């Protein structure tokens, strides 16, 4: 499926006030100002804006926005959504079964992580279905890859139950991630906060905590994003099966080597920082 019935609009841009600070080590500190040098997202950097809006009253302005992006020394990722549309990512170089690649995805029951040789499709989406005879939402399709061979790393988590209702209103959850790849380790940091905004990236400060370090050991240059879409009695046809897709947006930034000054609270929480190369002050 290559998802026809799409418009073409120019990209949109934004900046990040003070987002992207993470804990540099695993040592407890209290009432101290500490200076470090590492890969950090520079303050007030240039951030590309992607969104998925599918209003049916505009006769086709529906857009999906899952392109291919480069991976230059780590990325910063943020998401604002209310209906659980973002699902995961794929990392690799050629993504054409001649090299290995990494997959992270959630399928409404459990999360899987795989380093395997994949033959990825051009439009790797998921899908949800809505029935009318009863009020319920269920998943129906999983179209990500064609084949998988030579498959080295594996991890599947314990089951859970997930809600798939298409809520109306404003955005409720903000989710942030930092990805890095050094010495054969894939490092992830995360932080979740609740918000009540509508159409922009909030400005503020939040510190990200370590989550996991995966020993995958691969060449990584490019990455995509995985999205879910809704289908119901809206003139099917698969490639143009009236696929209205919720509402969500996400943001991408790039890391660079910098020097920072970190402030540790009484209780070892990071509450402020200074970027030494932003301006002479």
């Amino acid at each position: 499926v290559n998802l026809t019935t799409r418009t073409q609009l120019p990209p949109a841009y934004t900046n990040s006030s003070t987002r992207g600070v993470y804990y540099p080590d695993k040592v407890f500190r209290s009432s101290v100002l500490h200076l470090t040098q590492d890969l950090f997202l520079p303050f007030f950097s240039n951030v590309t804006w992607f969104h998925a809006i599918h209003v049916s009253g505009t006769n086709g302005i529906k857009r999906f926005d899952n392109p291919v992006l480069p991976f230059n020394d780590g990325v910063y990722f943020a998401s604002t959504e209310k209906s659980n549309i973002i699902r995961g990512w794929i990392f690799g170089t050629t993504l054409d079964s001649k090299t290995q690649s990494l997959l992270i995805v959630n399928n409404a029951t459990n999360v899987v992580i795989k380093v395997c040789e994949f033959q990825f499709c051009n439009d790797p989406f998921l899908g949800v279905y809505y029935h009318r005879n009863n009020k319920s939402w269920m998943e129906s399709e999983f179209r990500v890859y064609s084949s998988a061979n030579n498959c080295t790393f594996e991890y599947v988590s314990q089951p859970f139950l997930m809600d798939l209702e298409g809520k109306q209103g404003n955005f409720k959850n903000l989710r942030e991630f930092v990805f890095k790849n050094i010495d054969g380790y894939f490092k992830i940091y995360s932080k979740h906060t609740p918000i009540n905004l509508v159409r922009d990236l909030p400005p503020g400060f939040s510190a990200l905590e370590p989550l996991v370090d995966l020993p995958i050991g691969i060449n990584i240059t490019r990455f995509q994003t995985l999205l879910a879409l809704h289908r119901s009695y809206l003139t099917p046809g698969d490639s143009s099966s009236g696929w209205t897709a919720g509402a969500a947006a996400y943001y991408v930034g790039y890391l660079q080597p910098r020097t920072f000054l970190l402030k540790y609270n009484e209780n070892g929480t990071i509450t402020d920082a200074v970027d030494c190369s932003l301006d002479p002050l």
């Binding site: 695993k26 040592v27 407890f28 905590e209 209780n267």
Partner: protein, 49 residues
């Protein structure tokens, strides 16, 4: 846990995150540690004054 020294141990009030084991001060010296068996926080103070 393989860290050697000498001092006096005393119960502490600071609380660690689940991924932290011991802490340092401005001089980068160890002043707190979590007991491996009973998950409690202890402080370390020098003996000579």
């Amino acid at each position: 846990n393989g860290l050697t020294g000498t001092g006096v141990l005393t119960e502490s009030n600071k609380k660690f995150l689940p991924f932290q084991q011991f802490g340092r001060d401005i001089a980068d010296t160890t002043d707190a540690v979590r007991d491996p068996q009973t998950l409690e926080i202890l402080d370390i103070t020098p003996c000579s004054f």
